Amino acid sequence: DCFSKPR
Amino acid sequence: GQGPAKTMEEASKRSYQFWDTQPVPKLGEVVNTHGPVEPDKDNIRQEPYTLPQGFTWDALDLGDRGVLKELYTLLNENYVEDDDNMFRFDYSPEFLLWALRPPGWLPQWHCGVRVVSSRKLVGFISAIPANIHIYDTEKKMVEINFLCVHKKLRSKRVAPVLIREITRRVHLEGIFQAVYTAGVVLPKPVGTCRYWHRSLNPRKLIEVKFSHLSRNMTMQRTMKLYRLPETPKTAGLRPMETKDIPVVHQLLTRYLKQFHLTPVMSQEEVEHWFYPQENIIDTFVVENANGEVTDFLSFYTLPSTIMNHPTHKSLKAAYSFYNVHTQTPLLDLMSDALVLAKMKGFDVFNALDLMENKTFLEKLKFGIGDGNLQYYLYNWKCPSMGAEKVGL
Ligand SMILES: CCCCCCCCCCCCCC(=O)SCCNC(=O)CCNC(=O)[C@H](O)C(C)(C)COP(=O)(O)OP(=O)(O)OC[C@H]1O[C@@H](n2cnc3c(N)ncnc32)[C@H](O)[C@@H]1OP(=O)(O)O
Ligand SMILES: [Cl-]
């Protein structure tokens, strides 16, 4: 996994 | 120290001084064939690649408690962050043993870099064996994960050394292809998947600024939007047990045949990857009125440290793993997954748009994320695929 947060 | 690209158009400007030397397709090269980029080498370099002065190789025995602690600390302080330096993954020691010691793990594939004078751990990269189905080919490969360079070592070309050295150590075992993922664009993605996020505790997520309030939406409105049932609804949902290992393997094997990039798990691998370990991996099977297991859902635990917030220290995230349905609608199965993660105290439920996830992401109130997961093959040339064909 890499990092993501809600757009 | 020219930096990484996040979109393909950003990748168009860049030149890849290292990846241009590697057996991977060039970006923009249209691929209409299936096979290795180069033939297998039948004589392999015996000597480790040269590190810059003052650094040395050391294979990490993760069975040594102190050594496993050194690795957790390196990753806890230097691994994947968000762009705004607010969250960093918090891989636990038991999670690292789960991810880094599956069946067939090899000690030389836990490849660390230490400072010569102090023995301080400042670099790492790992391989685990993985049988990979890619289109019409099943091949023994490795999966490369946990590439990490200490922040004080950044932009000094240490990652190319780690990549070449783990390549050499894999070549020694007779394997010439690898699969890996990354949030940056490199030559050349075989598939691009997008993260989606299902808020479980919206108040905390907004407090620590993981998510934000919608333009005209209040906190009270948001909490009501994401409110879940208190208990699951699928008949016969229960945690996976030892007796379910065979049928879970059977369900997963048949289910993955419809995608184009999937792992091929032995029954021992299914046991390792799916048998529940608290705060690591949860698997729930559906046992029907006849006593037969027809579906299962699974998600793993990966918390993130919150860098600077006065009241919250850890973001507890669940990541969708594999979800197989034959009798329970996938929408019902993933709805129960959200409820089970909510009951277990998770703050957010993360999933990618791969496999059939697009069929339920919007309907279960997932919101699109700003991060992609790029899928890659090393030394294998094949056409790209849409996210719905990625099953890895
Ligand atoms: C057959 C067996 C084969 C086995 C090998 C299969 C391939 C394995 C491939 C690895 C699979 C990894 C899977 C995971 O673990 S993905 C997780 C990666 N880890 C992190 O993002 C943690 C935070 N970042 C770091 O620790 C460092 O910034 C890293 C180590 C990422 C780069 O260190 P640094 O910032 O100090 O840079 P440099 O000066 O040393 O080196 C610059 C070169 O590195 C290329 N680069 C940058 N990021 C990545 C990346 N994420 N994958 C592959 N290459 C990457 C970059 O484009 C440039 O090449 P080019 O642009 O000149 O061409
Ligand atoms: Cl080990």
Numbering used by the authors:
A (entry chain C): 3 to 9
B (entry chain A): 102 to 493
Paper text:
NMTs are thought to transfer a C:14:0 acyl-CoA (MyrCoA) exclusively to the N-terminal glycine (Gly) of specific substrates. Here we report a series of high-resolution HsNMT1 structures co-crystallised with MyrCoA and reactive substrate peptides. These structures reveal snapshots across the entire catalytic mechanism including the reactive intermediate state, thereby providing the high-resolution map of MYR reaction chemistry.
Accordingly, using an in vitro MYR assay, we established that the truncation does not alter the protein turnover rate (kcat) and observed a significant reduction in the enzyme’s relative affinity to the peptide. HsNMT1ΔC3 displays barely detectable enzyme activity, and its 3D structure reveals different conformations of the N-terminal region of the peptide substrate. This indicates that the low measured activity of HsNMT1ΔC3 is due to the high Gly2 mobility, most likely induced by the large space created by the C-terminal truncation.
